[PDB]
Amino acid sequence: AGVGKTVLIMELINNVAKAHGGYSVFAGVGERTREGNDLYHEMIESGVINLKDATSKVALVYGQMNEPPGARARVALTGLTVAEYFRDQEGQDVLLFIDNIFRFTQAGSEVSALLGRIPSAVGYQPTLATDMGTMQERITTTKKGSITSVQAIYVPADDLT
Amino acid sequence: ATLKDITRRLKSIKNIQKITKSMKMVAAAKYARAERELKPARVYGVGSLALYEKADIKTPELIIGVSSDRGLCGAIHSSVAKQMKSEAANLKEVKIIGVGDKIRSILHRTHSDQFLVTFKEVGRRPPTFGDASVIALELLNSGYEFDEGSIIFNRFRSVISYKTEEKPIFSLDTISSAESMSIYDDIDADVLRNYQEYSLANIIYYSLKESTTSEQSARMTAMDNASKNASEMIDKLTLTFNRTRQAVITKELIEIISGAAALD
Amino acid sequence: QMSFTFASPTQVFFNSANVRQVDVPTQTGAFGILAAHVPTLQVLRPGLVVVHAEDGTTSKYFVSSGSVTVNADSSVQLLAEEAVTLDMLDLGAAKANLEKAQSELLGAADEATRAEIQIRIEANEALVKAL
Amino acid sequence: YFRDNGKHALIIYDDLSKQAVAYRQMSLLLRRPPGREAYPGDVFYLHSRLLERAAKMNDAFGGGSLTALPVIETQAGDVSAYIPTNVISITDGQIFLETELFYKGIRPAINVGLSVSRVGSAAQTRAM
Amino acid sequence: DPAPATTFAHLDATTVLSRAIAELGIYPAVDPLDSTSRIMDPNIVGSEHYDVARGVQKILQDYKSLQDIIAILGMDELSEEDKLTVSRARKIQRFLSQPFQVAEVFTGHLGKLVPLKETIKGFQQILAGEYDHLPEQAFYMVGPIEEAVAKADKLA
């Protein structure tokens, strides 16, 4: 984190999405409002966010840790939906920067219990996979463009297995 | 074992790992220095052997193990052990001096009874000439009936190689007087002895140093060895670990469901 | 010439160097062992090693003990127990030791005891000698 | 409140460990799904919302503060425990205290190596 | 797994394999320390068997202690005699390795069955350790040890 993790990301957005005129989405899922805040200005600061231009190469969606898990989770879909706009509609390579797909994951699982479900392994939603599949499968390269998904990955249990 | 236990394990395996590593580099540090230091020395002891080298003085007729006090981190002790037991029958004199008291292990029984002396604090700052002289000195004043002595030590050969040596000691100063050794001048059983003396240390020093070089390097190796080993295991366990780990969790959550929740 | 090995456990000064001469105070005596000696064994008196390399230069060292052994062949090996340059040898100590050395000697004992001093006296002196 | 009164507050939440216990306990009594590690999922949210409520604010708003010192007492290595994990995912850093060190007499205890302040320098005095 | 745990109650002789062993190639590959007939007894089985078995179980077990050690060390520190036994233990292992006819087909390696006495003798000999000098692989996959002896020579 924060190595200029973000700097890099910012930079990435810069490097390609400017260069190759693509677009970017940052869907700050479950993030610290603070961290989105920090980032915000950081983009502002970077000028990648321009406040004089809403063609700051990133559209931001944040669904910080204070919404229903699902809601925060669904900020993910939201971001997707937008990015879909830019791909298909804007014909583009949208970059979908996501932080954290994990937190999403946790969130899916979180509702499940309460959903009276039996959410499988690790407590994880049984549909963990389907959730994943369907979203991931939304991500691709259409003929219209690409949604290149750059997914920030939190290391649950410092493990990935 | 049960995951705890595994960890209990692990903990220490790492510790070990470290520890092994500690020695490894440490040994290597000692070593690192040590090899360099060998130069004048090497040469020097190699020097020591001058004379026989030339005018070779051999009779129809002691022994002395040399090593560290510390274990067989190679086959140091055992090697000499072997070959000295190999010896002991044959007649030299069965006097042994063990540099290294891990000499005094490998041979230690009637090598609680075939020694003249044995040396310790072998390392802990690599041996120096002083020592060689030291060990030389008291050696002199010894009830060797200075036959044909041997010094068996492990002459290091390279980082990865040593050779268990012997050299013979023309402790029979008279062979050292004899023969071809004649052309020699300053020939007095004085400078003779008084070279024998000097060379006893020289050689001693050297040999010893070789031994120790060997010791430090084999140890080095050993100390690596272990630490990779550790690693591997850590790998092995660690899975099994997790797996069980979560597995655990899982079950309880299982239990928690439908055992404590649905039906309890 | 001679492979002159001027070595000390710690220091090799010359290493099989084709040196013309080393003047060499074995306790045998001071001699000018020249390039390629006769089988001879020598005990090093403390003195100087005067290392006439084939170079005009003759190097000083003061030597404590050891052997030079001046071989059947042309190898000369000064195997110096310790042979050091006056450069690093402190007269301030040496003399000081030396007077003292005799002083201590005065309260010394047997052939040996006295010797410990005397040897030293001799030594230190021969350093003092040298410098 | 203080924060909003441009006033600078320090809350020490000591200890959410107990809180969680209670909350679960509560859930269960409510015969309500708890969650992971037998504890409710939105106990995270619980806390999240709680901690989201702590802040460093624009000054314009009095820009007070609510500085939060949550405490969790380890049972060791069970940071893995859901709530610590939670908290970890939330936190601004963690102060690992090393008891062993304490025993060594090293007081402060700190396992410094694992202690972290994610933030670092903004909270730092140039002096420092 | 409790289920097998239970199962055991109904057992009166068991062959507990060791896949662990199996992985080492081995056939037959066993958990020896629970490959049974409950009626393991010097009366029931002859004592020769029995004692030998107890000895075997012993050495192998001891060895079983030791790998772990060896692994966490080398085997060097560990008394060479033990090192010997260790080796023997493998030999015993290898000698336990018994290849079959039906799976000469698989193995490319002869099928074997061994009358007991020759067996008692077999292990007993290895226990007498005279053979020791001879390699593991001589011991591997045989019927009578004799053939193994043969194979050793042949190996040499």
The partner residues of B8 in beta bridges, in order of sequence, read none
Q: Is residue C63 part of a domain?
A: yes
Q: How far apart are CA D94 and CA D100, in angstroms?
A: 18
Q: What is the DSSP letter of C7?
A: E
Q: Is residue C20 part of a domain?
A: yes
B240 min Cα distance to partner chain A (Å): 12
- With contact defined as beta carbons under 8 Å apart, do A141 and A147 qualify? yes
The partner residues of A26 in beta bridges, in order of sequence, read A60, A97
Both structure tokens of B236: 């092995």
Contact A161 B242 (CB under 8 A): yes
Q: Is residue C112 part of a domain?
A: yes
Q: Is residue B263 part of a domain?
A: no
Distance separating the N- and C-terminal Cα atoms of chain B: 29
Q: How far apart are CA E95 and CA E89, in angstroms?
A: 9
Both structure tokens of B155: 């002459």
Going B173 to B174 to B179 to B185, the CA torsion angle's sign is: positive
Q: How far is CA A138 from the centre of its chain?
A: 13
Q: Is residue B86 part of a domain?
A: yes
Both structure tokens of C89: 């040898």
Structural domains counted in chain C: 2
Active site residues of A: 5, 31-32
Q: How far apart are CA C44 and CA C60, in angstroms?
A: 15
State the Cα angle at E32 between E27 and E33, rounded to 5°.
Answer: 160
Residues of chain E in contact with residue B16, where contact means CB-CB under 8 angstroms, are 72
- With contact defined as beta carbons under 8 Å apart, do E38 and E15 qualify? no
Half-sphere exposure of C54 (CA within 13 A, CB side): 13
Do B46 and B116 fall within a single domain? Answer: yes
Do B160 and B86 fall within a single domain? Answer: yes
Calculate the alpha carbon distances from E19 to A19, E29, E30, E106 in Å. Answer: 59, 6, 7, 18
Q: How far apart are CA E130 and CA E111, in angstroms?
A: 27
Q: What is the DSSP letter of B253?
A: H
* Amino acid at the residue D71: V
- With contact defined as beta carbons under 8 Å apart, do B185 and C30 qualify? no
- 3-class secondary structure, A147: strand
Q: What is the DSSP letter of A149?
A: E
Do C69 and C7 fall within a single domain? Answer: yes
- 3-class secondary structure, E14: strand
DSSP secondary structure, C43-58, as one string: EBPSEEEEEEETTS-E
Do C52 and C105 fall within a single domain? Answer: no
Contact D52 A64 (CB under 8 A): yes
Q: How far apart are CA B148 and CA B95, in angstroms?
A: 10
C8 min Cα distance to partner chain B (Å): 7
Q: Is residue B168 part of a domain?
A: yes
Do B245 and B171 fall within a single domain? Answer: no
What residue in D sits closest to B11 (Cα-Cα)? D77
Do C37 and C96 fall within a single domain? Answer: no
- With contact defined as beta carbons under 8 Å apart, do B10 and B212 qualify? no
- With contact defined as beta carbons under 8 Å apart, do C74 and C37 qualify? yes
Do C24 and C78 fall within a single domain? Answer: yes
Q: In this complex, is the C-beta atom of D118 within 8 Å of any C-beta atom belonging to chain A?
A: yes
Going B252 to B258 to B259 to B262, the CA torsion angle's sign is: positive
Do B161 and B245 fall within a single domain? Answer: no
- With contact defined as beta carbons under 8 Å apart, do A69 and A120 qualify? no
The dihedral over CA atoms of B121, B127, B128, B133, expressed in degrees to the nearest 10, equals: 60
Both structure tokens of C20: 């013309």
Distance separating the N- and C-terminal Cα atoms of chain D: 31
Q: What is the DSSP letter of B107?
A: B
* Amino acid at the residue D128: M
Do C22 and C62 fall within a single domain? Answer: yes
Do C65 and C76 fall within a single domain? Answer: yes
Structural domains counted in chain B: 2
Q: How far apart are CA E18 and CA A105, in angstroms?
A: 40
Both structure tokens of A3: 């190595």
Residues of chain D in contact with residue B7, where contact means CB-CB under 8 angstroms, are 77
Q: How far apart are CA D79 and CA B177, in angstroms?
A: 80
The partner residues of C51 in beta bridges, in order of sequence, read C22, C59
CB neighbours of E41 closer than 8 A, spacing ≥ 6? E50
Q: How far apart are CA D84 and CA A78, in angstroms?
A: 29
Q: A133: exposed, middle or buried (C-beta count within 10 Å: 0-12, 13-18, 19+)?
A: exposed
CB neighbours of B232 closer than 8 A, spacing ≥ 6? none
DSSP secondary structure, D6-71, as one string: T-EEEEEEE-HHHHHHHHHHHHHHTT----GGGS-THHHHHHHHHHHT--B--GGGT--EEEEEEE
- Window 59-78 of A: residues touching D by CB (8 A cutoff) are 64-66, 68-69
Breaks in chain D (C–N beyond 2.5 Å) sit after none
- With contact defined as beta carbons under 8 Å apart, do D35 and A113 qualify? yes
β-pairing verdict for E36-37 and E13-14: antiparallel
Instruction: Using alpha carbons, select from A64, A10, A73 the residue that is nearest to residue D55.
Output: A64
Instruction: Using alpha carbons, select from B206, B254, B161, B227 the residue that is nearest to residue B43.
Output: B206
Contacts 24+ apart (CB under 8 A), E125-134: E126/E88, E126/E91, E126/E92, E126/E95, E127/E52, E127/E55, E127/E56, E127/E59, E127/E88, E129/E84, E129/E88, E131/E91, E132/E84, E132/E87, E132/E88, E132/E91, E134/E91
Q: In this complex, is the C-beta atom of A123 within 8 Å of any C-beta atom belonging to chain B?
A: yes
Do B245 and B115 fall within a single domain? Answer: no
Q: In this complex, is the C-beta atom of B49 within 8 Å of any C-beta atom belonging to chain C?
A: no
User: Using omega within 30 degrees of 0 as the cis cutoff, is the peptide bond preceding E144 cis?
Assistant: no
Q: How far apart are CA D72 and CA D52, in angstroms?
A: 18
Residue with tokens 């394999």: E17
- 3-class secondary structure, A98: strand
Instruction: Using alpha carbons, select from B203, E74, B52, B258 the residue that is nearest to residue C9.
Output: B203
Calculate the alpha carbon distances from D91 to A32, A107, A154, D94 in Å. Answer: 9, 18, 14, 7
Q: How far apart are CA A148 and CA A94, in angstroms?
A: 6
Do B11 and B72 fall within a single domain? Answer: no
Do B159 and B232 fall within a single domain? Answer: no
Q: How far apart are CA A77 and CA A63, in angstroms?
A: 11
- With contact defined as beta carbons under 8 Å apart, do C46 and C30 qualify? no
Distance separating the N- and C-terminal Cα atoms of chain E: 47
- With contact defined as beta carbons under 8 Å apart, do C9 and B41 qualify? yes
Q: E58: exposed, middle or buried (C-beta count within 10 Å: 0-12, 13-18, 19+)?
A: exposed
Contact D48 A113 (CB under 8 A): no
Contacts 24+ apart (CB under 8 A), E59-64: E59/E85, E59/E88, E59/E89, E59/E92, E59/E127, E60/E32, E60/E33, E60/E89, E60/E92, E60/E93, E61/E33, E63/E89, E64/E33
DSSP secondary structure, E90-156, as one string: HHHHHHH----GGGHHHHS-------HHHHHHHHHHHHHTSSBTB-HHHHSS-SSHHHHHHHHHHH-
Which CATH number characterizes residue B238's domain? 1.10.287.80
Q: Is residue B216 part of a domain?
A: yes
Domain that holds residue E68: 40-156
- 3-class secondary structure, E12: coil
- With contact defined as beta carbons under 8 Å apart, do B41 and B206 qualify? yes
Which CATH number characterizes residue E44's domain? 1.10.1140.10
DSSP secondary structure, A28-96, as one string: EEE--HHHHHHHHHHHHHHTSS-SS-S--SEEEEEEETTS-HHHHHHHHHHHHHHHHIIIIIS--EEEE
Both structure tokens of E6: 């239970």
Q: How far apart are CA C33 and CA B32, in angstroms?
A: 38
Residue with tokens 């059947």: C72
Rg (Cα) of chain D, in Å, rounded?
17
Residue with tokens 């220490």: B12
- With contact defined as beta carbons under 8 Å apart, do B201 and B133 qualify? yes
- With contact defined as beta carbons under 8 Å apart, do B69 and B101 qualify? yes
Instruction: Using alpha carbons, select from E107, E154, E112, E105 the residue that is nearest to residue E134.
Output: E154
Q: How far apart are CA C9 and CA B256, in angstroms?
A: 76
Contact B242 A121 (CB under 8 A): no
Do B118 and B146 fall within a single domain? Answer: yes
Breaks in chain E (C–N beyond 2.5 Å) sit after none
User: Using omega within 30 degrees of 0 as the cis cutoff, is the peptide bond preceding A100 cis?
Assistant: yes
DSSP secondary structure, B33-78, as one string: HHHHHHHHHHHHHHHHTTTTTSS---------B---SS--SSSHHH
Q: How far apart are CA D17 and CA C125, in angstroms?
A: 82
- With contact defined as beta carbons under 8 Å apart, do E110 and E99 qualify? yes
* Amino acid at the residue A49: I
β-pairing verdict for C47-53 and C3-7: unpaired
Q: Determination technique for this PDB entry? A: cryo-EM
Q: Is residue B264 part of a domain?
A: no
Domain that holds residue B133: 26-222
State the Cα angle at A10 between A9 and A14, rounded to 5°.
Answer: 110
Q: For chain C, what is the largest distance between any 2 Cα atoms, rounded to a whole number of angstroms?
A: 49
Q: Is residue B42 part of a domain?
A: yes
Residue with tokens 């802040």: D55
Contact E77 B71 (CB under 8 A): yes
Both structure tokens of D104: 């060594």
Any known ligand binding at D14? yes
Q: In this complex, is the C-beta atom of C8 within 8 Å of any C-beta atom belonging to chain B?
A: yes
Residues of chain B in contact with residue C66, where contact means CB-CB under 8 angstroms, are 198
Instruction: Using alpha carbons, select from C69, C62, C61, C55 the residue that is nearest to residue C4.
Output: C69
How many residues appear in chain D? 128
Three-state secondary structure string covering E71-92: HCCCCCCCCHHHHHHHHHHHHH
Which CATH number characterizes residue C45's domain? 2.60.15.10
Residue with tokens 């006769």: C38
- 3-class secondary structure, A4: coil
Half-sphere exposure of E66 (CA within 13 A, CB side): 23
Backbone angles phi, psi at D95, to 5 degrees: -110, 105
Do B86 and B210 fall within a single domain? Answer: yes
Q: How far apart are CA B62 and CA E5, in angstroms?
A: 66
* Amino acid at the residue E98: Q
Instruction: Using alpha carbons, select from A132, A140, A142, A150 the residue that is nearest to residue A24.
Output: A150
CB neighbours of E45 closer than 8 A, spacing ≥ 6? E39, E53
Q: How far apart are CA A10 and CA A40, in angstroms?
A: 11
Q: What is the DSSP letter of D112?
A: T
Each residue of C63-84: b (16+ CB within 10 Å) or e? Answer: bbbbbbbbbbebbbbbbbbbbb
Q: How far apart are CA A76 and CA A135, in angstroms?
A: 9
Do C70 and C114 fall within a single domain? Answer: no
Do B160 and B185 fall within a single domain? Answer: yes
Going B137 to B140 to B141 to B144, the CA torsion angle's sign is: positive
Both structure tokens of B137: 């000195």
Which CATH number characterizes residue C120's domain? 1.20.5.440
Both structure tokens of A132: 């994943």
Backbone angles phi, psi at D115, to 5 degrees: -60, 140
State the Cα angle at E30 between E26 and E33, rounded to 5°.
Answer: 145
Q: How far is CA B171 from the centre of its chain?
A: 25
Contact B253 A123 (CB under 8 A): yes
Do B157 and B250 fall within a single domain? Answer: no
Q: How far apart are CA B52 and CA B178, in angstroms?
A: 12
Q: How far apart are CA C12 and CA C25, in angstroms?
A: 18
Q: How far apart are CA B213 and CA A6, in angstroms?
A: 53
Do B46 and B96 fall within a single domain? Answer: yes
Do C21 and C52 fall within a single domain? Answer: yes
| Reported structure resolution in angstroms | 6.4
* Amino acid at the residue D87: V
Backbone angles phi, psi at B17, to 5 degrees: -55, -45
D41 min Cα distance to partner chain B (Å): 13
Q: Is residue C131 part of a domain?
A: no
- With contact defined as beta carbons under 8 Å apart, do D20 and D83 qualify? yes
Domain that holds residue C108: 90-126
Do C16 and C60 fall within a single domain? Answer: yes
- With contact defined as beta carbons under 8 Å apart, do C73 and C40 qualify? no
Q: How far apart are CA D23 and CA B262, in angstroms?
A: 19
Q: How far apart are CA A22 and CA B153, in angstroms?
A: 74
Q: What is the DSSP letter of A156?
A: G
Both structure tokens of B17: 């790992």
Q: How far apart are CA A110 and CA A68, in angstroms?
A: 9
β-pairing verdict for C12-26 and C3-7: antiparallel
**Region of B87 on the Ramachandran plot (φ > 0 left; ψ -120 to 50 alpha; else beta):** alpha
